[PDB]
Design a protein around this ligand. Sequence first.
Ligand SMILES: *[C@H](O)[C@H](Cc1ccc[nH]c1=O)NC(=O)[C@H](CC(C)C)NC(=O)c1cc2c(OC)cccc2[nH]1
Ligand SMILES: *[C@H](O)[C@H](Cc1ccc[nH]c1=O)NC(=O)[C@H](CC(C)C)NC(=O)c1cc2c(OC)cccc2[nH]1
Lengths: 303, 303
Amino acid sequence: SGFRKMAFPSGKVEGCMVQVTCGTTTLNGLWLDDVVYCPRHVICTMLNPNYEDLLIRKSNHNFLVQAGNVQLRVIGHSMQNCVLKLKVDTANPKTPKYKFVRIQPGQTFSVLACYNGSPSGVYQCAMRPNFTIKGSFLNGSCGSVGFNIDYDCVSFCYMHHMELPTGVHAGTDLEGNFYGPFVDRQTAQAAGTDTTITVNVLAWLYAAVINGDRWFLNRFTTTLNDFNLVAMKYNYEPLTQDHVDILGPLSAQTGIAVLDMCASLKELLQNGMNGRTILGSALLEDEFTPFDVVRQCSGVTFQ
Amino acid sequence: SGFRKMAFPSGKVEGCMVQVTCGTTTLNGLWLDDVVYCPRHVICTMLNPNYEDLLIRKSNHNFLVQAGNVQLRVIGHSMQNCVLKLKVDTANPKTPKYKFVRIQPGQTFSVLACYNGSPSGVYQCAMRPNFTIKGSFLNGSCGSVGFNIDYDCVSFCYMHHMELPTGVHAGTDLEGNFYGPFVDRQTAQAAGTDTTITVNVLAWLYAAVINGDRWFLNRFTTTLNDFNLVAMKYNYEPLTQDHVDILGPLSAQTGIAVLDMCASLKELLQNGMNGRTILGSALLEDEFTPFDVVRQCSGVTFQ
Ligand SMILES: *[C@H](O)[C@H](Cc1ccc[nH]c1=O)NC(=O)[C@H](CC(C)C)NC(=O)c1cc2c(OC)cccc2[nH]1
Ligand SMILES: *[C@H](O)[C@H](Cc1ccc[nH]c1=O)NC(=O)[C@H](CC(C)C)NC(=O)c1cc2c(OC)cccc2[nH]1
């Protein structure tokens, strides 16, 4: 019993973290096979950089790459969108089975926060509809990564580049393409309007039911259309039928049809919890996907 | 910027997790040097076990220990309080620098939840004043461990044995001694009355200030005595001067004396947040120690 915001075991990713220094800037890189991936702004010195030019100047030896104590000789270098790829003379023996994936807003992943090539800690978070994440990142964390694990395969989805004036965070996929409309410039860039991930809240309510919190379960039902109208008023993402279907397995487990839970959520948005808590929380939690709930409640393990 | 409930990187502990089977029961063990530590109730078959007797029957070969794919030959076995120690013929090459510690209520640690010797995920939690933890543990998780990391040293403090009727969790230190008044019997054991960790709430308020949430900061001050009276009414641990001193460094950082923050908390207990949030939360968070705050806000890393 019990429901926690659980992160993936981090060891497979820990074994890939390195430190990358160019001139005076040091940030984190990701060492897979004989390539180190890192954010390209390590070659900055930055209000508007011309990264292709800065890279003509730079030669391999200008990149100091340290894997713990060991220095790794850079024998080649290239750029792909906003990430630098440093070919090194040594393949990482701890490289896991891996993919690069681009996630969708609403999906979750674990962040391994690193400084100077060493891990500080791990937590789970959601890609917000506005393509930001509400993380815990200080200066020097750039190049920390986000990931999911599927059995033995690490799917890297996020590399950290920037903190916005709002104090939320923004970065790229491992092909260097930013999530959302940001650029890797030392300029102030505004977020974009966020909304709550409605399908995730419903998953979290099924998790509550599975654990034992049911007070919020109202006797009524509703239509997808009617619900999506009450949602718009409270800044909630529209629920699609793809979402309704993703919730089917939880619905079948708990004996509660999706539209009934939709009724029960519709109430909460209108009356609040009146001092009550769901799974130890007093706000409606939207950073658990339906998969996350099934994983945690089923004891799914990795390898 | 940003404050998350961050767990320790789990890789050092991942490298120690093994599967232990006796007859039909399989749970998790901790492999350090040539010893595997696990909960002794793996030799049960359980309403009131006589563990010393069951162990006379058992011979080494009766313990099936698997480290991933590899079987580890048990060449000796012994009990220490509620944990079994299985000497194996092979020393774990991934053993980290480590200590066994017994933590104090109010302190925090990370849990690496495992099943069948494999990790499911990692999260941070607090030892409650009543010596329980509010975890996420299913049947078969027993032998999962809790730990802290200090640079390169893993300090193991918790091994999981039981879930109480309340659905909170209870276990031992790595010397097999239970936290709180529980026993490893298949019986229903009641918790004991819990309270909120007052020093941790204050740390969490300094964390808020450090990040930018200050609305709750009242202009008044108060005495330790006066505050501890308002606390008792709301089921809050008494704040001692040892606690006040542990908060000194945060106080010095933020320019806010400890007793002033005590005034500002005294209000919240009396008026609530009136629909407002501190660090994205609408309840007063008590699972961050003062150290946890400084670690996270300072970028402290491990190795
Ligand atoms: C890389 O380690 C850091 C990450 C970081 C810095 C500070 C706080 N939290 C963090 O996570 N990245 C950067 O510093 C960016 C460097 C590159 C992409 C140019 N810069 C920013 O993230 C940044 C820059 C600015 C301004 O510059 C005018 C203005 C306002 C906000 C801002 N954020
Ligand atoms: C070990 O893997 C499990 C852990 C566990 C089981 C179920 C749910 N969450 C969990 O974390 N431990 C056990 O099953 C204990 C076995 C040993 C210590 C005997 N048993 C319990 O934790 C337990 C036993 C009971 C009752 O037995 C009459 C009654 C009520 C609650 C209860 N908990």
